[PDB]
Amino acid sequence: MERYENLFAQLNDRREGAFVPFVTLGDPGIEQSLKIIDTLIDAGADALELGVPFSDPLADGPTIQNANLRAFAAGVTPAQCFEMLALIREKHPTIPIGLLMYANLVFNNGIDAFYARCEQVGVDSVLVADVPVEESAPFRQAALRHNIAPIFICPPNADDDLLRQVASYGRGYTYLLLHHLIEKLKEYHAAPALQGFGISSPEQVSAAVRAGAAGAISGSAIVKIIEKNLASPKQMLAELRSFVSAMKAASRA
Amino acid sequence: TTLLNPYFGEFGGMYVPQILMPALNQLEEAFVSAQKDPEFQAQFADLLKNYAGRPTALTKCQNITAGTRTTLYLKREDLLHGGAHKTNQVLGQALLAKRMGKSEIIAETGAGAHGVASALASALLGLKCRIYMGAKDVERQSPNVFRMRLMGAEVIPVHSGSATLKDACNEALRDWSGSYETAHYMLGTAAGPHPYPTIVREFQRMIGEETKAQILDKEGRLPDAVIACVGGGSNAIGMFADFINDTSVGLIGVEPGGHGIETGEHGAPLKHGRVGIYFGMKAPMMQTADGQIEESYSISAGLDFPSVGPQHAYLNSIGRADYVSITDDEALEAFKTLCRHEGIIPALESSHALAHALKMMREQPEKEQLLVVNLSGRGDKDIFTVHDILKARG
């Protein structure tokens, strides 16, 4: 499918930034997770980034480490995550859904088979957190064979060779983390750039779009809100909706 | 793009987040430069000799082989400063850090031997050192912990995940990604992303180089086999490296069999795991059917790791090296036997290697064989552990 391309075209036509929240699937449990995700969408999330709990998330800070622990404590498995993904897509046909994966979960039962299951359930992209461009060939190839966008991180220590590879290899969007980066990505016809570096305030969304990015990914702020409201299922969904609305309003200007 | 090959056949690579790649490339270039630098080599040689005490003895063990046709030598890494082979490559990596103009050291440790080696080297060479060890490991190992702190090192308990060596490994990678401009990550074994499996082998290869010169001097031929325990793979690859091209010499690596392979409570992923991607490398892992990294087990803290360095996986796959396992009970018997018959208290890690050599001898006592066991450490750290077992057992 072309969910990301259709999204960016709609946002370009509305002079609008994307806002994309991250959550860990099954945090703090499957049903609460499904309701959390529905609230994010209803509150105006343009796309979703969804983590599958992994035993050793070496690229995650403390916020998301504990999100994984909450999920494992609820018995969440990759297979259960794929059931959730099919239900989410069955409810929400157009919203782009990206996964944030660790390499072992993709490689475990065969790389091709992983991206085939992604395609089956209606995922749009996969970011493998511990696969740099240098090691990415079998992942990218399998992704593209199954109509999944492979997402790459363009870090703040990126050089020109890296910018060209990310531009050439990525699809859907480029996960950013400067004017130089953004314009150079554009020069190399890279997937639209989403700023993902410590996005926690409405103003950071408006700064990202102003910088020339196609929008912003809030990589941990949502999980923080879950964390702070575990005993209040009601407030949780309430603060989630209020946050996403504010971030998304910031992307219209 | 790299200067050296990051793979050993299918195994190895650089499976890190993009942000860490410049750190790994920088380290590779510094290592390649250092390996061609006579001044670096001389500084490293000076520290090995005059600070750590190399060369280490090669001891002939007559009493334990009496009445058989085995001749057994022990390569005495237990006599190196710090009490284990870990000191060799920490000295090299500390010099590399300085070459790179880094002033800080990050290290992971399970048993505490690598942590103590990292802290001693940091104290000698003027580096600020922080050690990740993880709650479960820190809660015990209070001796090695106090030594680390008694040498000026910061010891950071990790409570993330299982709270052990793998998470220690995790938090070390987490820290380095942000700090690599100032800090060097002093990985403690021949595993992890390139270029560490290569660096750690080259900075441990004097074990085998000395062993070859010593056996030639004493016996006038190469050994029939050299035998080493395999946690991540550093002592073993340090003993093996200089014999890889001597095709008559057997290379035997001994993984921990724990309570028994059949129990699943072991640390033998090379022979009883399956290939996965974790800690920056593609290598045999102990993992659930679903690809979560499993927890390993061994009586010896130093071998309790659910993966193995990629060069071991490679040497196994081509049939160059053979890998076996030894259970907790076999390792404990070997520990007791060496104490009583040779007057050497071995580390429980090294006792796995010795146990397999004793099996080679006992199973075929009229087979003529010249064996070297790498005695990777002394077993002072294990005296309380062995005490509590023999007291519990009767």
Ligand SMILES: C=C(/N=C/c1c(COP(=O)(O)O)cnc(C)c1O)C(=O)O
């Ligand atoms: C894991 C540690 N020690 C490992 C170890 C090992 C196993 O590590 P290698 O496979 O890298 O040699 C063997 N012998 C001794 C005395 C050891 O201390 C550590 O000190 O962190």
Ligand SMILES: [Br-]
């Ligand atoms: Br097994």
Ligand SMILES: [Cl-]
């Ligand atoms: Cl939708």
Ligand SMILES: [Cl-]
């Ligand atoms: Cl990430």
Ligand SMILES: [Cl-]
């Ligand atoms: Cl020579």
Ligand SMILES: [Cl-]
């Ligand atoms: Cl042989």
Ligand SMILES: [Cl-]
């Ligand atoms: Cl053989």
Ligand SMILES: [Cs+]
């Ligand atoms: Cs592209």
Ligand SMILES: [Cs+]
């Ligand atoms: Cs003998």
Ligand SMILES: [Cs+]
């Ligand atoms: Cs191991």
